[model samples]
Target: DNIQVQENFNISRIYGKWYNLAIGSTSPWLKKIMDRMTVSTLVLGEGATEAEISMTSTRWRKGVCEETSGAYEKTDTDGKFLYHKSKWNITMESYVVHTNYDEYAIFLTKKFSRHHGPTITAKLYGRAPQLRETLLQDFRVVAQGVGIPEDSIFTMADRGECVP
Candidate 1:
């Protein structure tokens, strides 16, 4: 039920480090747990070949990390791509259908098992690590156009390990 972004962003432009500003969830517990998280991605592809994607994220809890890798092939339906297999802390053998593409895109996950989770995880990504003021304003317009709450939005700052 997610509205697709009006402008289509090149998937290749999304290849780079991205900080998790916000996540979609009604559960407060999940929100608190995912606070201060960040995701970094690298995409590789060639004409007529499946695109390879590798991603990693830092969890709020100390000494904890997550990583996942997967390959994607373009689908014939509606500019969508199918995710062959992607896994993180949990083994996920799943398929994702990418609907819209641009600075934002919506992807639906295939139901592989009866106990499978949500069928989709819509994402809105920025080309830069931090969104500019104008971009944030633009995003606000987008969010308003889609009826997303402003409070749910989160932002990340640079935090590097220090040596004494």
Candidate 2:
């Protein structure tokens, strides 16, 4: 069966830093700290297909900077990826739904009930902390394509906060 994956997509283009511009999902937990989710992705092995991702975020737990890493193994489907982190023993399932190389990307992550409960989180990422409305509209389309409801998506807000 063919998975709706990004075929012929340039994997090399994905290796870089990304900042969360927006996120939507059934879970409201991330909405509170969405702006803090910044990630650095890298080509892990040969072919630039495999990936290693790391993220740093400002803590919401009465704390400061927090960081973590995850391993991504490309699936047979071009955009599909799966990872299990030993730190949490949670399996993360995700897909590269959309991207524009340098400016923006849309990622859909699914958490199975067996691990972190069941929920789907769709993220809109930009090279910077902000993006033009036109580029943001692409993320709206992404959510619709993923069947994520309007109420499920939210824009990341800037509160001029900092971590030290």
Candidate 3:
């Protein structure tokens, strides 16, 4: 299924802090070790090419926090939507992949390590946090093709709330 975004994506709309509503098993051990938790904040520049993402988590060692900053830009492609650029986040071991290019898109990364093999560490991002449901559904559809197990998945949310 192909998803399309409205017009050129406005990077500004993607800015702001976001709590992890859910996570795939491919997530970092740090996240699991800390109990499937993490937070990310995106700050967009005047142009889509410039942006910064700040990520923090107690999901690491006690009292430890992580912050990564990067710039983003749109990619040149022949699809209804275009991929955006994100460069410089420490949490990101490598470049990100853009499977869709609308108001929402699936961002994926290469396998965490050789031991993990070639797997997807993907995150579905949208204009609002409430978009988790759609993202999760889309993830499931796409995940099926890759053989990811439904049982191993987990979602993130505010403290005191259960993972959907």
- Which model, 1 or 3, shows the larger lDDT? 3
* lDDT at residue 117 of model 2 (Cα atoms): 56
Q: How many pairs in model 2 have backbone atoms within 3 A of each other, for residues 3 or more apart or on separate chains, i.e. clashes? A: 0
**Candidate 1: how many backbone clashes?**
3
| Residue pairs of candidate 1 with colliding backbone atoms | 8-102, 9-101, 9-102
lDDT of 3 by residue, 98-127 (tens): 333334544444443334454445455543
- Please give the lDDT score at residue 161 for candidate 3: 18
Alpha carbon deviation, residue 101, candidate 2 (Å) = 0.7
Question: Which stretches of candidate 1 lie above 4 Å from their native place?
Answer: 5-22, 25-29, 39-48, 51-61, 77-79, 84-124, 143-147, 160-164
| Predictions in order: lDDT | 0.40, 0.63, 0.41
Candidate 3, poorest ten consecutive residues by summed lDDT: 88-97
lDDT-sorted candidate list, best first: 2, 3, 1
TM-score of each: 0.50, 0.71, 0.49
User: What lDDT would candidate 3 get against the real structure?
Assistant: 0.41
In model 2, the Cα lDDT at residue 28 comes to 69
Q: What RMSD value applies to candidate 2? A: 4.7
Model 3 C-alpha RMSD to native: 7.4
